[PDB]
Amino acid sequence: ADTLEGSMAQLKKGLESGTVLIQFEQLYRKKPGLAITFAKLPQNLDKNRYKDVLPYDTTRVLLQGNEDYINASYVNMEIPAANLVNKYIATQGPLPHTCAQFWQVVWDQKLSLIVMLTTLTERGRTKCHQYWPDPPDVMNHGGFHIQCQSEDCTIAYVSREMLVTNTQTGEEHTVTHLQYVAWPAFGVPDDSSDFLEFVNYVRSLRVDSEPVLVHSSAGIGRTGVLVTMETAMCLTERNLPIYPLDIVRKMRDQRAGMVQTSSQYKFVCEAILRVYEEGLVQ
Amino acid sequence: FSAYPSEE
Numbered sequence A: 001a002d003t004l005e006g007s008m009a010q011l012k013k014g015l016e017s018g019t020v021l022i023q024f025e026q027l028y029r030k031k032p033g034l035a036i037t038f039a040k041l042p043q044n045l046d047k048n049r050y051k052d053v054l055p056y057d058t059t060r061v062l063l064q065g066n067e068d069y070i071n072a073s074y075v076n077m078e079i080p081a082a083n084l085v086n087k088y089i090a091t092q093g094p095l096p097h098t099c100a101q102f103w104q105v106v107w108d109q110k111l112s113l114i115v116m117l118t119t120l121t122e123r124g125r126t127k128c129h130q131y132w133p134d135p136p137d138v139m140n141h142g143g144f145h146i147q148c149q150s151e152d153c154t155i156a157y158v159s160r161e162m163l164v165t166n167t168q169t170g171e172e173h174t175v176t177h178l179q180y181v182a183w184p185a186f187g188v189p190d191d192s193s194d195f196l197e198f199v200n201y202v203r204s205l206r207v208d209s210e211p212v213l214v215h216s217s218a219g220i221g222r223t224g225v226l227v228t229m230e231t232a233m234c235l236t237e238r239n240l241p242i243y244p245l246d247i248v249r250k251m252r253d254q255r256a257g258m259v260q261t262s263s264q265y266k267f268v269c270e271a272i273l274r275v276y277e278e279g280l281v282q
Numbered sequence B: 001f002s003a004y005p006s007e008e
Helices: A004-017 A019-026 A096-108 A192-205 A221-237 A244-252 A262-279
Strands: A072-079 A084-091 A113-116 A138-141 A144-153 A157-166 A172-180 A212-215
Touching (some): A004 A262, A019 A244, A072 A244, A096 A144, A113 A192, A192 A221, A192 A262, A221 A244
Parallel strands (some): A084 A212, A113 A212
Antiparallel strands (some): A072 A084, A138 A144, A144 A157, A157 A172
């Protein structure tokens, strides 16, 4: 598998050609042979924000001891040479009637970090339900009370600390919630440097072995860019080869369609080169 | 039910 420098030569060479973009367009969005059954059942159709963004049966997230369906997928990115696995749950922006299941996932797995890569609305249309209350209010979702204890806006994202109370048992759990608001659907981040800083910030907030919950509107486009970038950061820092196409394929084997547009792939490939060359010593 | 848009 060659080396970081070699893979980086090939990537910059291939961006010039550009074979890297041709090979992206050739890649399947949906892995052939992977069953998608539960997502299309009558009771589940309106639990999908988009008709064509559905979880595979093999990687779909199940609620513990609870039959309710949710459009969410486990996505794990391995870096074998580093004995490292970065775990994610990739999901859509909740609908009004899916907030209960979203918070159940957070509770089940005591997830401490949610990364939301969308605004609530775009162009007068709702892209994600507001599944948390404006402080100081308290919301009930499916027998979870949710309150926002802290809310602070930076340039490009909002940082919120949320308290989740299980009303059945009286137990509570705290979650950090990062909402990246400067990144429109089917496009690239408004500022590349804000994006790279945000990814590295997310990396720093990981808790050992705990998946990061990541969502956008569909949970594949902007989410796929973020996952690709975190993977690449880990690889560059360890002097290991980076093949973006292998990374996208690996995500797509776990949730169809990750990285929605060619423009997004080109963005992430360029950002990978940028980070490599910024960090390069000699 | 709608597909995930890639345009306006």
